[PDB]
Design a protein around this ligand. Structure first.
Ligand SMILES: Nc1ncnc2c1ncn2[C@@H]1O[C@H](COP(=O)(O)OP(=O)(O)OC[C@H]2O[C@H](O)[C@H](O)[C@@H]2O)[C@@H](O)[C@H]1O
Ligand SMILES: Nc1ncnc2c1ncn2[C@@H]1O[C@H](COP(=O)(O)OP(=O)(O)OC[C@H]2O[C@H](O)[C@H](O)[C@@H]2O)[C@@H](O)[C@H]1O
Ligand SMILES: Nc1ncnc2c1ncn2[C@@H]1O[C@H](COP(=O)(O)OP(=O)(O)OC[C@H]2O[C@H](O)[C@H](O)[C@@H]2O)[C@@H](O)[C@H]1O
Ligand SMILES: Nc1ncnc2c1ncn2[C@@H]1O[C@H](COP(=O)(O)OP(=O)(O)OC[C@H]2O[C@H](O)[C@H](O)[C@@H]2O)[C@@H](O)[C@H]1O
Lengths: 85, 395, 400, 400, 390
């Protein structure tokens, strides 16, 4: 329509569970290109030991990945939290 | 300097109460004359001390002969201009009707002088008022953040924002044609533009794979006028400067009656009051709803009809309000020792009340529009150079 | 005499259009001051006649000194009694602001002698306004038939009918009390009765697995009064005639706001009512529903607020309106000659259109209330499918 | 004189055909310069006849020195203007690159006095062009009816209607700004209006879950659009254009410049900055390429190469119907048996001489005019009498 | 030097990005006068050289009398030729409209030489132009591979590949005719072949095959216009006997408003139709999402194509892959005041900060032949010779 645009960012998956300090995340195939260029650098987290983040309106929550597994077949992740920005 | 419940509050908890208030079903803002001071505007006592300076020979009749003004408040600079104009506007009609010419000749001199002062202060740009793209400039920078935040803080399938204002200028319309969004104001057409009230009930959508807001002006605009007897018209700034806004300023005794719709002037006619009434109606119908939040800024609390309406709405447990007032200290001091005006007594009473539905912010410069606009939440432009590259590719 | 779309229509198609309209989801009726003429009511022309026949001095001041009304119109009964109560109110404010004590006393009379010829015209029976069982008289015979027909034509699932009116008189209450039918009006209680906006959302029900309706008075009534700022109170006729009605007819006192009526032309200037604004929020919300039909009768089209609603509601493909106007031929003429008032022009702009959702009915005495009520149908309780009874109707002319 | 699929049909089946063509998913109308003759407009023959007796010095030079027009066609006003406006630019583009300096000034006169004569025709009211409430007159009575009918004849779910045109006048905005209909045209804003190709996909909606609207496509530009050195297209009003740039063109006698965006020439692909002239002709071809589609044509003389190819190449879809209105059909069938005729009298006979039942042509002189086209259209039947069992109602009338 | 927007890559870093971009929905290829050299083509410079040193006497009026060309760029050997042809046609038309003799003849004498030198270069096989199976030869071996793999790398239910082109010769046709696939160009018929723009929306289908589209931007040798206002296509064996032979073996003869190549007669409302109808399709193909565009052979000396490919990039799912051999020779000249738009634009492109512009350069490793190899992959003769002799 007119000039005003809102969306800028892309992601990998979405939260689906919380089971006592233990997050469950379902991964996407919509972002065909898991590459998402931006101001400074490009990144994609697909292995344990890595760090990810969630936005909660006013703050950012920081998590570390711990596991990966299956269940086109489905994939999941498990993570813990270490703080916020 | 932040009292919620009669008990002090700190900035980091405040800044998180705001983020929660901005998630409710209905959200709105009410602005005033002070919000236009960082753009070239003035206030309603400057407007009076710039009048009693240039025109000191009309200030004796208004006191000794016709009894429209009081010496105490004329000296303390506490006069209300809207009512004065609206009364001088019917004195003239009565005289015209009963054929009293010597007084009809004087009230024109009075009104051609009042309208000059109230008009000059409201252009914000002088002679560039009649030109294009006046919202690219840097004085309208803190008016776009407001509109962008209020929108980006909404989810799909959710009501749109509402802005009520008491000014009669265009600072808030110039700054949305740049962004590229649509403001609803109750008018339609281009070669003949007219007022249709039902328009405040419409919206846009898409049919193949878009952003709007609502604006309510309670005192009028420089851009509305009447030429027939049953139709109110709207025009553009360039098209108004030619017609009338130039004679008003650069001629001495040009005045044409029952023609202008600012500020709340010709209210006895039954086609012009129709326009002022619907706005108040819709305001009092918005302020009475579940899950509602209102922010106030720039308003001085000198109207008896808005205070009653705001108070009556606190009998519902899901209405929250946030107020800004810089002179809180000097007001409390005067009210303690049996003093103060009817504008300070109300705000002091609200401060004293033992409710968690009221918050007050008085810190002098800390309660201004620019601070207000940064207290709002934003979450956490390489696409520009191309247009000027193409423009450089001239040949 | 009957137009639909700018073209012409005939009776036997009109009577079948009306039948189809009355089976819709939402049906309504808006009445005026002429509907109450066959019961003892009056009209504004007669109010002006009464005024200039009992007060001949104020009528003289009103033409010579202040120049508020002209001689042609006075002698030929054309004055508007609605734009005069406003000018006389405008003069008083000025005189009171600049402290004159004779013009602040020669206008109160002019203004309290006009509020007194407008109440006697809303009493329909006179001294018997305070008595009981006034809906058993025969003047109220068609007001009952209207309600009966309206209600009876509703089936289960559909909503109840609505009735809008400007009059101050009591003529539908008196007539519904005589049948046993409850009208919701926004008030509740008997020993202290008050207005609550959320009493228009209620309805009845039977507790071991009914007739009712709604009434909206837009311009006030004769039994309402205000004491505080947020408390309006209702009262019966006998308990009103004693307090504040027999003291402003038979005693010649000055006027203060004993009861709340809106007879002027600018009804927003009164910024304390807060009940004027709850009725129009319901009118405009009634007209915006899909599958809606509205009949109009008795209204002279001299109100700037209602015309805009009616005119802006015709941008919806499921809204139908029917209008009765007796003096249509005398208006088309005056408007073809380049003249006309604001009332005749408004109805001519409606007659001359190209949408089949509009219908206008002239013809003098054929456009009256007693005739409006006979164009409405009764229902068929068990409908014969009739093919045994229809092929025989064919056989009648078929046979020979 | 109505040919369907090469055969003949009459004015009792033509109407039942139209009533079934108007009940389809997509409906549209393409207009021309004749539809604006009952309002004050003029044609190209009139432009030529008014150029002759106002600039006779340059007509000589054109016939004699440059050999651009034959002296014969002039006398009988058979000249085309859209090739004459194209040849002058070719001449001016070589005189420049050659650097001669007394032909530029002789062709600028001829290219200014020729642009001056279209505006005076496309104003339609002269000096009352810069005024308000201009569609309350009678001239636009048949423009209002067309929109009324085209809208009313829809249903829930169906798509809104579209209107393509080639004229420059405002005889279709003036008429909707009186009913209160909102036409979508691409632009947005009041103080700074701009063309956005994405607001052709906008529609209405309500909030308590203004339902009349339509779209307008001007193909050759307007008398109100202007391009600024900022490289944007801006729209203003008819009172802000008169006093700004189209008051000198008429009265000043100055040279021309791209002040307003009109192109009457024949091949305006030359303009490569014409990105507004490329969205219209894309939407046009995206419209006729859909199932269950109907189009009516009126006022077009068929002298445009770009549009006829579209029409032709759209006939290979089996769910597309056209209707065409050409008055001088007999006189043009007569002139082709001799193997002669112009190039526009062939394109219509080719269509009239097909074997597909999806092409209809209407002649008859003054029976193919705009005011008869609008009266051939139907009104809708709101409450259809099912009349399977009231079919016998028709028998009831007379069999005795 | 695989520069990628202010960075650098390597062979495999590139050869995986290509496989990524080949899975998109909308694939598009763009070719110019460069990829036609291996088969026997000439660039725009050699033809100007030849015209200079073959027809010197008349070269002066172009600079002295009529002012069509500039002496500076004439010497520098950088001068656009089809615009010159277009303008000369206009001059001739004006001089024939107003009855003048000398300026008519003086241009009828120039058009011939220009068309001669421009046709010879594009014949592409000499006198085997009026013969069959010219696509079995060895020069047309990489186009066949291009088509085969660009088609094979497609999913079922997916769109079809798009090939735009700036040449006006018959190679991609000769090759597809050898493979056995069907090309669509907007023409239909055999005994009278005509232009139908709405044919670009068709597609085959089976009941119990594969195909593609072809958009030329400057015309071809086999399109022309007869005394009646319709545009016709023809075969080579027929065109050769009709007009071309005389063009190449006669000194002075001209037929105006007949031929359609290259952007010559755009001042006729019947001929500009077929040019515009291609550029607007180009635009509408660009403006789609999830699209990739591979550019190999173009010199970026065009205002309009530059503007379009520039404006195209705002929405992010449009990927561009340019090829340009002589890149550093311009990086090292832009530092100074000297430079032409061709190089200014490409360095501005390589000086961007997003991962779409992917300029490439190897001097000779950025060519058509390596472009082909950069892409993935999905006895008849003996038997037919046996049958032949048998
Ligand atoms: N930069 C600033 N930012 C925010 N607020 C400011 C600033 N500067 C001054 N102020 C505050 O702005 C206030 C200005 O108060 P008034 O001039 O009365 O504004 P109004 O909109 O009430 O006046 C119109 C009303 O008057 C009639 O009653 C009618 O009913 C109208 O409703 C001061 O209190 C300053 O503290
Ligand atoms: N027996 C009859 N039956 C039906 N209609 C009649 C009859 N007799 C006369 N008429 C028609 O009645 C019409 C005259 O009605 P008017 O005097 O204008 O009453 P109003 O309601 O329009 O205006 C008064 C209100 O307007 C403000 O809202 C104030 O609140 C006032 O209360 C004519 O058309 C007659 O043909
Ligand atoms: N009252 C009438 N009602 C209907 N049609 C009429 C009437 N009077 C005349 N006509 C018909 O109206 C037609 C007038 O023919 P022309 O002036 O050439 O129509 P144009 O709009 O094409 O002309 C300009 C355009 O032509 C190019 O295509 C460019 O696009 C230009 O923009 C005749 O067929 C008359 O029979
Ligand atoms: N074997 C090869 N492989 C790949 N590229 C090559 C090869 N040989 C040369 N090149 C490159 O091919 C390029 C040849 O550039 P030019 O032929 O002038 O450009 P154009 O074909 O777009 O000219 C047509 C335009 O001319 C008008 O202006 C119109 O506007 C047309 O658009 C050189 O840069 C070589 O590096």
């Amino acid at each position: 329509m007119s000039l005003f645009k809102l969306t800028e960012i892309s992601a990998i998956g979405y939260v689906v569970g919380l089971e006592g300090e233990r997050i469950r995340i379902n991964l996407h195939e919509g972002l065909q290109g898991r590459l998402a260029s931006h101001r400074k650098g490009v990144s994609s987290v697909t292995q344990p030991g890595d760090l990810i983040g969630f936005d909660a309106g006013n703050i950012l929550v920081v998590a570390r990945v711990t596991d990966m597994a299956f269940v086109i077949p489905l994939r999941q992740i498990i993570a813990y939290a270490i703080g916020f920005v | 300097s932040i009292y919620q419940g009669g008990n002090k509050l700190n900035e980091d908890d405040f800044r998180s109460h705001v983020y929660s208030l901005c998630q409710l079903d209905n959200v709105g803002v009410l602005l005033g004359a002070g919000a236009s001071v960082g753009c070239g505007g003035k206030t309603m006592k400057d407007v009076w001390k710039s009048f009693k300076q240039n025109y000191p020979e009309l200030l004796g009749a208004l006191i000794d002969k016709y009894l429209l003004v009081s010496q105490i408040d004329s000296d303390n600079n506490l006069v209300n201009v809207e009512l004065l104009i609206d009364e001088a506007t019917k004195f003239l009609s009565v005289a015209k009707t009963r054929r009293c010419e010597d007084e009809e000749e004087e009230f024109r001199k009075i009104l051609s002088s009042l309208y000059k002062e109230v008009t000059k202060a409201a252009l914000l740009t002088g002679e560039q008022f009649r030109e294009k793209n006046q919202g690219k400039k840097d004085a309208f920078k803190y008016h776009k953040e407001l509109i962008s935040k209020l929108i980006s803080n909404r989810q799909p399938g959710q009501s749109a924002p509402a802005i009520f204002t008491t000014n009669y200028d265009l600072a808030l319309e110039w700054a949305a044609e740049d962004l590229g969004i649509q403001l609803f104001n109750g008018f339609s057409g281009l070669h003949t533009r007219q007022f249709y009230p039902q328009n405040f009930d419409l919206a846009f959508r898409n049919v193949n794979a878009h952003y709007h807001a609502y604006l309510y002006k309670l005192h009028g605009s420089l851009t509305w006028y009447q030429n027939d007897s049953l139709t109110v018209n709207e025009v553009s700034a360039s098209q108004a400067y030619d017609e009338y806004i130039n004679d008003i300023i650069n001629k001495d005794d040009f005045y044409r009656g029952q023609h202008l719709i600012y500020p709340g002037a010709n209210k006895y006619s039954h086609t012009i009051g129709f326009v002022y009434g619907e706005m108040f109606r819709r305001f009092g119908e918005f302020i009475s709803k579940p899950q509602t939040a209102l922010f106030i800024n720039g308003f001085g609390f000198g109207d008896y009809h808005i205070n009653r309406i705001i108070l009556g709405a606190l009998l519902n447990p899901s209405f929250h309000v946030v107020i800004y007032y810089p002179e809180l200290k000097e007001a409390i001091t005067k009210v303690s020792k049996g003093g103060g005006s009817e504008a300070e007594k109300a705000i002091v009473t609200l401060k004293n009340m033992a409710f968690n539905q009221v918050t007050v912010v008085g810190g002098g410069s800390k309660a201004y529009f620019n601070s207000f606009v940064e207290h709002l939440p934003y979450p956490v432009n390489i696409v520009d150079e191309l247009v000027e590259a193409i423009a450089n590719l001239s040949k």
